[PDB]
Design a binder for this molecule. Sequence first.
Ligand SMILES: CC(C)C[C@H](N[C@@H](C(=O)NCc1ccccc1)c1c(C(=O)NO)[nH]c2cc(Cl)ccc12)C(=O)NO
Ligand SMILES: CC(C)C[C@H](N[C@H](C(=O)NCc1ccccc1)c1c(C(=O)NO)[nH]c2cc(Cl)ccc12)C(=O)NO
Length: 86
Amino acid sequence: ETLVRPKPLLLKLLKSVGAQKDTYTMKEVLFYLGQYIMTKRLYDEKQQHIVYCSNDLLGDLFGVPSFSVKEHRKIYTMIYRNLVVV
Ligand SMILES: CC(C)C[C@H](N[C@@H](C(=O)NCc1ccccc1)c1c(C(=O)NO)[nH]c2cc(Cl)ccc12)C(=O)NO
Ligand SMILES: CC(C)C[C@H](N[C@H](C(=O)NCc1ccccc1)c1c(C(=O)NO)[nH]c2cc(Cl)ccc12)C(=O)NO
């Protein structure tokens, strides 16, 4: 699998949910992002596919006020703008 190196702000976010490393697979990045979204309760309680991220680090990184977990290609792109491959 492709190994990626999150930029400093994304890495800070990942490590806040127990990520240990400086290089990751995209699946690991998505896993830790999910953990962040879950533990901070950023998902809509009625519509769990909706993530709210205005005035959160996640929003500043992704460049959106909210997104749907179903927007896979977009999420991949939003994550990728915070990476570099290694
Ligand atoms: C509220 C949400 C975090 C719940 C979580 N959903 C995730 C999920 O939909 N993953 C499929 C997927 C596939 C490709 C791109 C984005 C998302 C998911 C996960 C995940 O690790 N699910 O286990 N991580 C995510 C990160 C982002 Cl930014 C968006 C979605 C996910 C879940 O546990 N469903 O049982
Ligand atoms: C070899 C090839 C099939 C790649 C595929 N992995 C993709 C992947 O990196 N998934 C994690 C992920 C997916 C979407 C955003 C961020 C992170 C991936 C998957 C996938 O189904 N992984 O199991 N789905 C993707 C959707 C988009 Cl838009 C972009 C990437 C993926 C894989 O390893 N599948 O077992």
